[PDB]
Amino acid sequence: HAPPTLWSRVTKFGSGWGFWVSPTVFITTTHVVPTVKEFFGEPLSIAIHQAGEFTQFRFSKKMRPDLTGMVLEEGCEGTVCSVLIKRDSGELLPLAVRMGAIASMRIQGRLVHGQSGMLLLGTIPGDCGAPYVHKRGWVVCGVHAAATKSNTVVCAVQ
């Protein structure tokens, strides 16, 4: 079960969502990012790393000081994660997903270094950037990127 504070790290952003790893680090899915002079007010002049549909902003002022800093892993196979999905309506929908292999893929002409996973309640357009998380003794392990036509999802990872 997830505390409100963890859900409060999930943030509407571009055409999807992002996730405050810490007061200074923000992660999201690349195709969701606005093609702008500033982010959250800060001007890019921010350390911005895009690799394979995975995007990470490191700000130089603390943006969410209310938050502690969680671990960001480069994935997690078999790890049962929780995708913290927020919908436009405010509904919170933590999906259960068993993660599998790490494989890079070109989905609709986009290089996605991601991890696959099966849905143990599906995803929809607009959900991308939602965080894949698990709890060791909380960790974030990817951002949502894609899903098959039917139960299998893909998160971009670092």
Explain what the structure shows:
Helix content is 3%, strand content 50%. Strands 9-10-11-14-13-12 form a six-stranded antiparallel β-barrel. The protein folds into two domains: 1-69, no CATH class; 70-158, no CATH class. The radius of gyration is 14 Å and the shape is globular. The protein is mainly beta. It comes from Norovirus (strain Human/NoV/United States/Norwalk/1968/GI) (Hu/NV/NV/1968/US). Processes the polyprotein. 3CLpro-RdRp is first released by autocleavage, then all other proteins are cleaved. May cleave host polyadenylate-binding protein thereby inhibiting cellular translation.
In short:
This protein is mainly β and 158 residues long. It has one helix spanning 4-7; strands at residues 10-13, 16-20, 25-29, 38-39, 42-43, 47-51, 54-58, 71-72, 80-86, 92-106, 111-119, 131-134, 139-147, 152-156.
